[PDB]
Amino acid sequence: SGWRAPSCTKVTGDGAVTFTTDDGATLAPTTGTLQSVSYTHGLVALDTPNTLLATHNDELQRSTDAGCTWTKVATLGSGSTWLTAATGGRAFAWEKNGGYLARVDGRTVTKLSSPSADIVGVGTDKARRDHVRLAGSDGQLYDSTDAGATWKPLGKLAFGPGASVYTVSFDPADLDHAVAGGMTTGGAVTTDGGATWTAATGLSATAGGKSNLFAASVSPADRNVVYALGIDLVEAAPNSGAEGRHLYRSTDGGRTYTRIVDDTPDTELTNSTLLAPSPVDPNVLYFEYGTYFQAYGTDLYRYDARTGKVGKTHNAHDGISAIAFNPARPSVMYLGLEEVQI
């Protein structure tokens, strides 16, 4: 049998992962209660039917009934890891801006030796389950053909030497398509695996203005659609009174961006706002804002490019640290949660 919607109303798990069928208006109860301090940065649905992986702090967790039950698989070397799925029951765990890198083959954890001590992105080739790619914070891509066993540098630096690169986001349909984001250097895009990079425009409303690109996510449903989080540093000039933060959308694969969301009390943005594009609708982006502060809780936002408006739901958790979608019923969203109050 293939992927199915969860066959439960309550989740057997420690509380780090739940699901919603209504865009976050209601969250499935969990048997366990999430404890401070907890982050769930890693959460992916695998191609293996009804199988997901999550990292709750340094606990690697697995579900094989589409999220109804979560069980501990192993303890990872890092307590802060993100997950990238690969074809054939495989995933890579990695610490963002850290050095830890490991492979998950089913239930087997293999520590890898990263070619970078400051990892800012990982991508997998869906047509070749051994072809994995990694980016370092200087903007160097590294390529591997042996499931991460060994590595070699690939292409040129996204922004040239001396850059501080926040992220490299790989197109899930094509490892050779990547978007990089840097400090004052804005965005870049490659369609050839890092051999040539083109500087993006549109992150600043001023021609040639500097910008930051903190995070980007290529739509799993359209290689031409890229969502991004960044700052217009001209708008955020000293003494301006504006932090210049926006969400952006590209329809040419990362060459040019347009502002789609502004940082306001109605749509609150930070330099680490989670981006979760819909895997089936290139018009739709989910994002979050949450804080422990004053017990505000968490907003789960939904942007729709058809109209350009943002809706939201609210829950009481300190934050949503990761999002994945059920491939058989993508209206079912898996949420990895944070609890951080002292």
Partner: protein, 59 residues
């Protein structure tokens, strides 16, 4: 060569405009130097003093 008011401006700008929860020391230095450059100019004493303060700890 940096007083309390200028220190607050430089590091508040670095945090809010340039840093993330996973930023490491290398990126803090880049952010602090760029923030002081934004506020006071690349040839300023403020930038020189920020650079030297991070230079002191080998970064």
């Amino acid at each position: 060569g940096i007083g309390r008011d200028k220190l607050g401006k430089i590091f508040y700008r670095a945090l809010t405009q340039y840093l993330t929860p996973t930023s490491n020391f290398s990126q803090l230095r880049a952010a602090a130097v760029q923030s002081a450059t934004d506020l006071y100019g690349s040839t300023s004493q403020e930038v020189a003093s920020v650079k030297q303060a991070f230079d002191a700890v080998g970064v």
